Every structure is written in C-alpha cells, then in structure tokens.
Amino acid sequence: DSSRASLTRVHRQAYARLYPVLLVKQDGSTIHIRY
Amino acid sequence: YYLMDAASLLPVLALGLQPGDIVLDLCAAPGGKTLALLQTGCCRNLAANDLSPSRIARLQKILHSYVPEEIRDGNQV
Amino acid sequence: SPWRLLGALCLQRPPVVSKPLTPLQEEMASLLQQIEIERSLYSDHELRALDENQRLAKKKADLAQDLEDMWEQKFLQFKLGARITEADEKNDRTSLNRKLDRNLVLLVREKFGDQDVWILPQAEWQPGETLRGTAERTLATLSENNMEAKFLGNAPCGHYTFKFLGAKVFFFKALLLTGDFSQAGNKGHHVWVTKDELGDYLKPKYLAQVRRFVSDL
Amino acid sequence: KARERPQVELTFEETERRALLLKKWSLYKQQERKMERDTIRAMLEAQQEALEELQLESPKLHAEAIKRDPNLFPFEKEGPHYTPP
Amino acid sequence: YKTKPTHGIGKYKHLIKAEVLNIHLTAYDMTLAESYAQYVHNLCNSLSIKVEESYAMPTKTILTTHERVVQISGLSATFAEIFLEIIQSSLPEGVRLSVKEHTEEDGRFKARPELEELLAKLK
RNA sequence: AGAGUGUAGCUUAACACAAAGCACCCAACUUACACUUAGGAGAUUCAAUUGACGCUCUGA
C-alpha cells in the first residue's frame, strides 16, 4: 500500500511552495518529487 | 572581556574545532582555556574535570559569571 | 514412518506499478495540497508568478506564465511509458506483466499419478541438503530461465500433511524482482496468478489454507 | 518581503469538509490497521504451527531451520514504481 | 524495620536497574522519507521491537538528496520474516531499503546521573 | 460426520442506577518516540433454560 504513505505533508513550520515536479534523466523512470 | 595570558590561548587555537564536536578537558579549573573553548561556539558538549573541588569552585564561578545560563542548559556543559 | 518428500516455494513477485487511489485518497490529495500552500513564508516561483507580473502591469499602465507553458506542453507530445500494461493482453497469464499493481505468485501444472491438479511448484527434499536448500534447487529445474530470486531467512511459513502412507510439505517464501522468461513457449505450464483468483486456481480444500501466509495487500 | 499568503479564512462550508473527511480518514485507517493486525496474527501462528510440526517430525532439522541468514547482511530491495524503465 | 515482617516493603530500586540493525530510507523528496520512518517506528513499538535512534546525516552537496535512518534491535531471526515482508510491501516510492549492522567500528556522551554509579563500580 | 465454545483485541466487568475498564486510530507540539491536548469507531451471533449461524479439534 504505497499510496497512503506517498502523499504526505511535511511537519516543518516554514517551507516554500512544493510543486510535484517530474523526475526523468534518461532513466526511463517517472518519479513525482515536490520541488 | 577576560584578562589572561595570550600564550594560554594558543592550545585552543591548536585544536581544529568544528561545529558539533565533543570536547574533553581533563584539567579545567581554574579556567581560561575552558572559557575560550566556550567562546569558540563549535563545541556541542563540554566536559570539565578537576581533582580539587576548591579550584573547580572558582571555575564554576567564572563560567557562571561570564557564560549565561542559556548556553549551559542540560549537559552541554 | 512413511512420508512423501515434498517442499514448496512461494515466488511472490512484488508490484511494479503503484497501487490505485481510492476516491478519498485523491480527495485528500487536493485537500493536503490546499493546506500545504496555505501555510508558507515565500517561494522563488511566486516572486516571478505575481510580483514581476504586478510591476509589469504598473509599467504598462504608465513572463512566468510563458515559461510555465512550454514546460507543460513539451511532455504532452513526449508521451511517457504506459501506467497500465495489463489491459492490452488481458489474457496473458504466462506473461510477467499481467498484473503489476498487486503481488503475484508463479504457479505450475503438476502431473501426479492418480490426481491431476494445479499446485504451487514442488521440491523433492533430500537428507543431504538442508530444508532451505530445497527451494534454491528447484529454481532451474522447473523454470529453466534466468532467476535472480532473493531468498530471505530460513523459517517454515506453513506445513500441510495429507494421507491417501502420508505426505509432508513445507512452504518457504522468496522475492523475485524480475522474472524474464527465456522460453516463453516452454512445455512447462507456468502462469502468474494474483491473490483474488488464487482461490479459484486450486480445487483442494486442505491446500486452500495456503491463503493464511500469503497476504493480499 | 516575508509574506506570501496572509488570509485563508472562508465560510463554514470548508470546515464541514475539514472535519468530516478527517473522520473518514479515522475510519479508513481503522480498517487498514485491523487487516494489518490480521496479517500479523495469521503470519506468526502459521510459522509457529509449521515449526512445531517440523519439530515433532525431526528434532535435528528444526535446529538447522532456525539459523539466521547471512544473505540479509547486504539485503537491498526496492518496491512499487510509477512506470517501468 | 528488619525484624518486623513488613521489612523491605520500601524496596524500589530492585524493580529498576541502576547498572543491531540500521534501516536506510533515502528519498529525494523531503516530505516523504520521515513519514515512512514514522510508520516503521510505529510498527516497531507495537510488536515490542527496541529502537535506538533515528539519526540524519546532512544532505549531499550539489542534485540534493537526504538520508533518514532508523536503528532497530531485539529482532529474532524467525520474527524477521513477518517484519521485513511488511516493510518491503509498504515501500512508498522507489525508496532504497537497506539493513546495515554495527561492525564494532561504527562510545556515547554519558549523563551526569549515569556517571556516579559507574564511578562507584569502577573503583 | 461427531467432540467443545460464544461480550468490539483482552477481562467474568456487569446488582444495577449501565451494556463497563484497559487496549486502538488519525489531528497539533515534537528528527522521532513518548507525555499531554483536541476528536473518532466500536460489541449481550440469531430466534424461545432450549434449537439452529461463526469458530476450533478430531473423521479419507
């Protein structure tokens, strides 16, 4: 059950806006990373 | 400020102190070098030791009078 | 005491595709996004998104959107890999890519003397080898391909004894990350079977109890 | 400048979701912990029974069964992914 | 009092005493790693598994990835089976799962309360 | 096919004046745990001491 743990909000009091940026670098693999 | 021989300040400079380092001072009292180690601000935890409680008393006095309570906290010194 | 020398290997292939979202999950995804954005100090993107746009508006009265555009539309035509490679075959149980959102077990057809039934791969245990060693032996004998199945700790997961003389079978797990099959059309009848049809796969009552040590997840 | 989003207040409509959907989380997570614990119980009982059965059959084989595996020293494993490489 | 049958009813310190795996959970996202670390720790607490520390060493210089570690102990070889299976299944997004060991080369700063009895037994 | 049993995970807790007391779950403080705070889901298996629905063990 990857789905429940995957989407989480960080418990830091102050952080910049996180957009789910796609991470591909000639690896053929899609990863959604907040940047 | 603290008046002390600038010679005694050299061994503290001789330590390549980095932030988050754990410092042991086997002979602390009366102080001077210990105060300098505290002034560095790179030491996470301080260990101060001396055999004679007479001398450690004046060590306690000087670190109390010079160093605020905020920095002492819990087992940082 | 008379015993039939049997052993079993559970080849639980891990999911390759992430589990689908229940309605509540995407509902809360949008929600947590809202909470996330509502508590922030400043972000470098908002400087170009709003601030420079505002002063540009002031300049005009007397673009971040543009650079966001090309980002968006470039990967639209550059189509990524298929999330679901399940539905295209729909029937290829022999294929590794049959179901990738759930744990699957490799299952072979055994041909016994007096009963003909689909059972989990067998292992003929020897007193020379250890119980664990039996599982490793049957990698090449039954699958005849490339194996990189990871073997965890030695422990009996389950035990079943059936009498016609008697039989004894012990179950051990293994993790097979990649199961590329050299001979797709091998004589051996091997299929990758999900948990939900695993019950319908085998007929016996006694070996239906297997479900206890194999998790659906 | 150190102020992104000052005001985020809204009508009771938002709070209705904020509350009830969080209660739905409590329910949803309740079911999943129950089934997690179900697997726990099922697993430990299964291995226990199996080991007992091996023990009574052969006293020497269960001894070699309960060794810790040296292959779990460099144990490295991944899990699920978005799309296959 | 010694001779009275109530003796040693005040005894308390006999009830107390006055006298290993590492799990790596690296992810690029900083909103993900600690969440799963939390989850694993919660599983450990429930099944009576001893935990040492959740240490974090700094982000690699640039692009930037950070490592979250959980120390665990008291795990049996038999119980490992169940435990490791769950922590493998619960893997969120391509997180490197490691099991590292203290190799007798990986000392602690003792507290003042702990030191006095240590000194008493030393001499 | 027989042999036993039955309260949400546990407890004979239950005279009532009630179906109780620990376990459990998200939320904020926390690297975390934990404590505390603010919330949620819970049962006396079904029909009149008896009979049959669920579980368990022996029946090839």
Tokens standing for B4? 């002390």
Angle between helix axes C23-38 and D12-57 (nearest 10 degrees) is 120
For the CA atoms of C35, C38, C41, C42, what is the dihedral angle to 10 degrees? 110
Give this entry's resolution in angstroms: 3.1
The DSSP 8-state label assigned to residue C47 in this structure reads I
Residue D74: its H or E element: none
Distance in Å from F21's C1' to C215's CA comes to 34
**Distance of CA A24 to CAs A28, C26, D84, E99, Å?**
7, 24, 12, 27
Residue C176: its H or E element: none
Contacts of E34 (CB under 8 A, 6+ apart): A10, A11, E68
Full residue range of the structural domain in which residue A7 is found? 1-35
The total of structural domains in chain D comes to 1
8 Å CB contact of C217 and A1? yes
The total of structural domains in chain A comes to 1
Q: Which residues of E touch C217 (CB under 8 A)?
A: 89
Residues E43 and E87: their CA atoms lie apart, in Å, by: 9
Residues C150 and C9: their CA atoms lie apart, in Å, by: 12
Closest CA to C11 of C160, C162, C164, C178: C178
Closest CA to C12 of E79, E43, E81, E85: E85
Residue type, B43: C
Residues B54 and D34: their CA atoms lie apart, in Å, by: 64
Tokens standing for D65? 């069964």
* Residue carrying the six token digits 């009576």: E48
**Pairing relation of β-strands C167-174 and C4-13?**
parallel
Residue D79 belongs to domain with CATH number? 6.10.250.3440
Residue C110: its H or E element: none
Closest CA to D1 of B30, C42, C89: C42
Q: Are E26 and E65 in contact (CB under 8 A)?
A: yes
Residues C104 and C92: their CA atoms lie apart, in Å, by: 13
Tokens standing for B27? 């002979």
End-to-end CA distance of chain B: 21
Residue A14 belongs to domain with CATH number? 6.20.130.20
Q: Are C32 and A9 in contact (CB under 8 A)?
A: yes
E45 touches strand F (CB under 7 A): yes
Gap from A25 CA to chain C (nearest CA, Å): 13
Closest CA to D82 of C95, C28, C87, C21: C21
Q: Which residues of A touch C82 (CB under 8 A)?
A: none
Q: Are C148 and C177 in contact (CB under 8 A)?
A: yes
Residues C162 and C2: their CA atoms lie apart, in Å, by: 12
